[PDB]
Write a protein that binds this ligand. Structure first.
Ligand SMILES: CC1(C)CC(NC(=S)Nc2ccc(S(N)(=O)=O)cc2Cl)CC(C)(C)N1O
Ligand SMILES: [Hg+2]
Ligand SMILES: [Zn+2]
Length: 256
């Protein structure tokens, strides 16, 4: 099945998922001099105070911190969005080295990693229905660079030991995602897709301009995770990022 290696990676995905070569694929390069400020954008509203995390899972591609979305608690609204989008999970994409790891790029610059906070449109009742809609998902993307530690990331870092291999999960309650956010909510936005198979074109991307800093020791622990399952040969979970895809005349709008 699909992965990030030479024989199952992003170059191969189109065979099982033809939409890989579609009209609104993600990620993309954000060309800052082509992106236009949009006065019609309303302020972005990220309300994570009432968020309820349940557990963390190694799914053999990345790790997901999953949230209880059976009530309107952690919500993303405003900006380019119409209505209310509920937080369901977050995960990261990262590299084997600090010079790569992000999926979106900024004037071709690759960051050390990228956080995706995934939200579904409440008008569609549940996540599975939303991913069948052009405006079913909103993903908040945040770049990570290596420098000072991110205190609010440490609880995640410390639990990775318990989920080394594919299929492992651990209880992960009372994690506050507010501690992963940069100061500024300045962002670029474009219509796109999931960056993993099934690559569905259901996402409004909201990519923050300001990166968060994480320590070298924090990212190093990300790189200790395994793609493989328990008792299998060790395949380090690194470079789990899809490269930039063709923009195809889409317009990236800036909030600033
Ligand atoms: C839609 C559902 C229920 C979950 C899907 N899981 C997804 S779409 N995981 C996922 C994969 C990639 C992203 S990303 N990188 O675009 O933020 C975000 C998410 Cl939630 C997989 C499929 C569509 C087969 N089923 O199981
Ligand atoms: Hg869709
Ligand atoms: Zn992602």
């Amino acid at each position: 099945h699909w992965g990030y290696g030479k024989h199952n990676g992003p170059e191969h995905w189109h065979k099982d998922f033809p939409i890989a070569k579609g009209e609104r694929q993600s990620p993309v390069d954000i060309d800052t001099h082509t992106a236009k400020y949009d006065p019609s954008l309303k302020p972005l509203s990220v309300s994570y105070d009432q968020a309820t995390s349940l557990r963390i899972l190694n799914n053999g591609h990345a790790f997901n911190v999953e949230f209880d979305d059976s009530q309107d608690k952690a919500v993303l609204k405003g900006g380019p969005l119409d209505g209310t989008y509920r937080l369901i999970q977050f995960h990261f994409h990262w590299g084997s080295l600090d010079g790569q790891g992000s999926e979106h790029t900024v004037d071709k610059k690759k960051y050390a990693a990228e956080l995706h906070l995934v939200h579904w449109n409440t008008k569609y009742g549940d996540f599975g229905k939303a991913v069948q809609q052009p405006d079913g998902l909103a993903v908040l993307g945040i770049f990570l660079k290596v420098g000072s530690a991110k205190p609010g990331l440490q609880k995640v870092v410390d639990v990775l030991d318990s989920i080394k291999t594919k299929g492992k999960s651990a209880d992960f309650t009372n994690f506050d995602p507010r501690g992963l956010l940069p100061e500024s909510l300045d962002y670029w936005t474009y219509p796109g897709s999931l960056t993993t198979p099934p690559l569905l074109e259901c996402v409004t991307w909201i990519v923050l301009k300001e990166p968060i800093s994480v320590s070298s020791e924090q990212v190093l622990k990300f790189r200790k995770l395994n793609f493989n399952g328990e008792g299998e040969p060790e395949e380090l979970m690194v470079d789990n990022w899809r490269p930039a895809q063709p923009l195809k005349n889409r317009q990236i709008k800036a909030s600033f």
